[PDB]
Amino acid sequence: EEKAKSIDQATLQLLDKAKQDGVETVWDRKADMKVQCGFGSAGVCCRNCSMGPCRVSPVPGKGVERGICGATADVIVSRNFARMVAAGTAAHSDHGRSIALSLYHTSKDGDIKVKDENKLKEVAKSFNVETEGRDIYDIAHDVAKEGLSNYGKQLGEVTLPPSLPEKRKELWRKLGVYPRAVDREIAAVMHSTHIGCNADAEAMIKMSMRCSLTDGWMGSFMGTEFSDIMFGTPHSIDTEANLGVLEKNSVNVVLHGHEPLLSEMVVEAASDPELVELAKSVGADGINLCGMCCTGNEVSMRHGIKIAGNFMQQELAVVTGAVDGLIVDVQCIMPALAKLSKSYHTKFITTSPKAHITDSIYMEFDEENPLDSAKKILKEAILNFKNRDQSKVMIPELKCKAILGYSVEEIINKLDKVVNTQIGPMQTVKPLADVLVSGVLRGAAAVVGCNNPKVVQDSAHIETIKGLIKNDVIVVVTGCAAQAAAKYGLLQKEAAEKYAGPGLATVCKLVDIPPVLHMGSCVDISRILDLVGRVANLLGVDMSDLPVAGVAPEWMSEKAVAIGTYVVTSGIDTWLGVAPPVTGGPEVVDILTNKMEDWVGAKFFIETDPHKAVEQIVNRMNEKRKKLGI
Amino acid sequence: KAKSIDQATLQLLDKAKQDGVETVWDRKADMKVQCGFGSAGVCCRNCSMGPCRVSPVPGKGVERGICGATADVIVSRNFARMVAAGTAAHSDHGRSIALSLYHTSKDGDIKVKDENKLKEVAKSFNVETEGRDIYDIAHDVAKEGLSNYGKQLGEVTLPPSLPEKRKELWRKLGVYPRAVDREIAAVMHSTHIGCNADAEAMIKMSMRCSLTDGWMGSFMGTEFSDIMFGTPHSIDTEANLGVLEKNSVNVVLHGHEPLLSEMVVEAASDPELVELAKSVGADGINLCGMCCTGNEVSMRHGIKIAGNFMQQELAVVTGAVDGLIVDVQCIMPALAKLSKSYHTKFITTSPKAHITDSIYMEFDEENPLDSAKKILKEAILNFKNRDQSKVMIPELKCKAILGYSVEEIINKLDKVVNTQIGPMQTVKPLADVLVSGVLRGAAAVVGCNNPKVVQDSAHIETIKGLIKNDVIVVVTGCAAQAAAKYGLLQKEAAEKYAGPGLATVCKLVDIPPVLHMGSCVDISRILDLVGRVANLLGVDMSDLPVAGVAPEWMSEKAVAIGTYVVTSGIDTWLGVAPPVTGGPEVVDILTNKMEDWVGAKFFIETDPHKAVEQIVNRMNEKRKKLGI
Ligand code: SF4
Ligand code: SF4
Ligand code: SF4
Predict the structure, then answer these.
(1) How far is C-alpha A381 from the chain's CA centre?
(2) Domain annotation covers residue B145
(3) B33 vs chain A: nearest CA distance in angstroms?
(4) A494 Cβ contact partners less than 8 Å away, ≥ 6 residues apart
(5) With contact defined as beta carbons under 8 Å apart, do B28 and B8 qualify?
(6) Same domain, A220 and A254
(7) Nearest CB to A187; choose among B88, B332, B351
(8) Angle at the Cα of B38 (from B37 to B39), degrees rounded to 5?
(9) Is the backbone of residue B513 left (phi > 0), alpha (psi -120 to 50) or beta?
């Protein structure tokens, strides 16, 4: 009663209906967990071998100080942080690997085609793949094979994108964190955290750092570019967000998860004449496709597919009683959805052999016959409309307009508007660099990440975003933070005069954009690395020299720890709104929040007060601006 | 309540107390009652919504984690990350050996010592050998081995001794292995919040991952080590702490990777370093090994074995170790603090395993022998700092025989081959005694030490109970070094402890009743031996009277080992309970349903006398089912 469950009204309406229905939510289980383990919470519990469990004092000089094998608190903490990075990298690795495999199976008349040939041709140059006088699918398969070798090559060097500054690469080499193959780095961390291996906090964190780079500049980067090649590069597009996008008289099919091939094929199947007529024959007005979380962002960026909600609204979407099919693939799918859906007519469908869930309907997605497979899954959801009980349906009359589709290419297209045809060239990030250098924009910040019941859901996202724009810091968003901004109304051109400071409101008016730009899913944080890297190269500096920052105000996942680590290792200061489990390791805290700056020019900041985080980001950018002389 | 059954160990445990230094046994006692949640496997820390803990008792207390994960979901994921971690330790080990095979050369530090084996292994990888330079074949084979760690398209290469029935069974079950590092990433991905929440699907993913260790990572490591360093053959050595010499420079190799220990063995015979040892006042250089790096150089050179996992601190407490050179895995970080109470130089050599307050001397794999010589010289010069008044080396050591590769076992079995009836160079004589019942079965006793078990007591009790019941025993790792210290690795142990059938086979074949087949990656030699017998009898490995036992296991590598031994069709007994009691479905999958999937299952038995009765009854069940 001192603290609300959420700032969103639709969410609070469906939290009351969930209580009345006698169903359980993530908030209830959070409360049932009561006081969470102080050892685990400080990172000082170890279970890396059956001599354990071990727990050491999170207060140095008192209590039990070493694990049975001899591991100190700093060793136990730093190995635990490293497995979070390895696990997060593994989630993005398999995401990207699946996309590179889909690129390898493309064909002229097949279900998966090349929609951006110009983007394929430029990506090919980065992989030294010839394009002159060749069939577009021969180039596609060559590029897929070269991308696949980044996951498992054992000899030679990995391929990294051209926007990554040479200064940053040299810095990584001298530090010993230059990335090797994606899966090879994940195995390296899992090996070194084994009992009787690494027992040195600095060496362990540097291993984590190296691993995390295989995510941001490889697995996530390739996943975004390859997705663009096959499904199209995003451009500005309108959509609507929040649970009010569900329709009582239509068939509501909610896509949840992260992999783009499935939801791209379900979007195509939704326009199939037979399934369109089927929807009419079951008594509906048509098919209403909605997305949640990253797959939702993915199809919303490319097709304007309505966004039903973010991470902690997934159960509440089912509580509306209007979801006929909930089609999921992998990552961030609460297993509670299987039990919750037993209280409604909703068919909870699992499609990935990487993520089976007991008591869910398994309908394996056949990546060899994608559209036929998506048609079969969609048909089950349509037929389920007949089992709806309209008397128990409750869709809050709350939704918001939102603008998104801000790829690096689209941001550059919009900047061309303020370019003088004579003085300068078109199609560059120079107009953005010009406002940052002049001080019309103080800086640029990325607000990313999940929800976490430790924070009033969406409160820290909105208060952080709003304060950074008020202070003339242009903001770019991805993931559930971007959906929190969408639902609230920050992704609108009108938000500029309503919330932004003087410089950012003026730039918005001139460039005709909102003050917050939705750049996509969590793999699409790679677009932000790309944008910052292009600006760095244009000003002939490293990324750590620029007034930029990253913020993860309500993070939860191991992916978010891999993201935070690769943003900092790449030279961008990162603020965490949820403390990672490290307080019990004084040397780890000092490495992350201090010595790190001496290694990569950036460091972590842990701040659970969004108002104080904004003050710290603004002061940090002002120090970097002075050091850079702007 | 005894800390150990070994006298030399107990002598040094008294000197450790008198010196005021702590040991693994003291830190075990300081840990008091270990967490019940973590012990039952019902704590979860896979995301920052946690820590979560659920009731290990169904129907009582908190039943789901904040994301909705049940106890079976939390337990199965935690077990799977142990396998993935255990696979990653053997993966990097093997990957490093394949990279060393790729860098071999006629006049370089690393050569091809077994050309015949290279040419046979090259055949398994579809690498041409006729009319080719041995180093071109070597490099092709190394590249084909390396692609088993990371290939994204195509199929992996598996050994010829793996029966077609077993491969077929894995395909239909959905656990046929993919690339080693691809599978480790698959388990880490599927255990991430909001992915797999199904116990059977998660254990099957762990089973699939473990096979990339036992039949790929470890198997390649062992074969490639044989190629470059020579296949083991019968050899004598001495075991236990009494192998240390007060008047020599004692250099103890501890860790797992064979290249460094091979290079230190070569460096120890360098005339300059031999003369340097005499100039600092020593009789010479006394090389000893501990744990798996010890098992590797002992199997190939007869290098003396100072001790096993829980003896590593006690070797330093002797006050006689001038240099303790280590690479990776099972190296207790307490060795850095412990060494500071003596003159010992605790040298870390691998960037994969840095240890705070240790002396880091990076092993240069581009100049292996020069690098080894520099490291060894430091240890020799440190003899000048010895304090002979603090030295106490127990007058306790044992003779041991080892070097039982599959090739050497076959060479010994030729002694009981009838020139007319049958062919030589096959496992048929072993299959014949198993079928006749002169040998009831064959068991592998493997694994670590764990302070939850009186050190070495469960290893010895298990092995003795099995050889007494005519079950021939094969050993690796710290279980093999427990047997070495005790005196079971001797031809004389047959009359003392073996049953009548096994005693006869031992007299005829001229072998001890307990066969040391190497290090932990050399468990792949056991898979290879069992698979060859299966194929010779035209059956699957689950049809044979064989078993695996890890009486005092501790590491994530042992969980990976147990999982691929069971997935390969060999029943496995565990002497230390894994963290699964809180997941009823997981316990049913591991100790029951598993048998329906792969023809073998886990058995959890902390009483070695009960484990021997169960293994014997189980083999008699399988013998009856097979009709022998
Ligand atoms: S790794 Fe070391 S601290 Fe960890 S559970 Fe094993 S003995 Fe304990
Ligand atoms: S195993 Fe560890 S983190 Fe988990 S509840 Fe127990 S002490 Fe706390
Ligand atoms: S994964 Fe589920 S059970 Fe594990 S800590 Fe995160 S919320 Fe809790």
Answers:
(1) 27
(2) yes
(3) 10
(4) none
(5) no
(6) no
(7) B88
(8) 90
(9) alpha
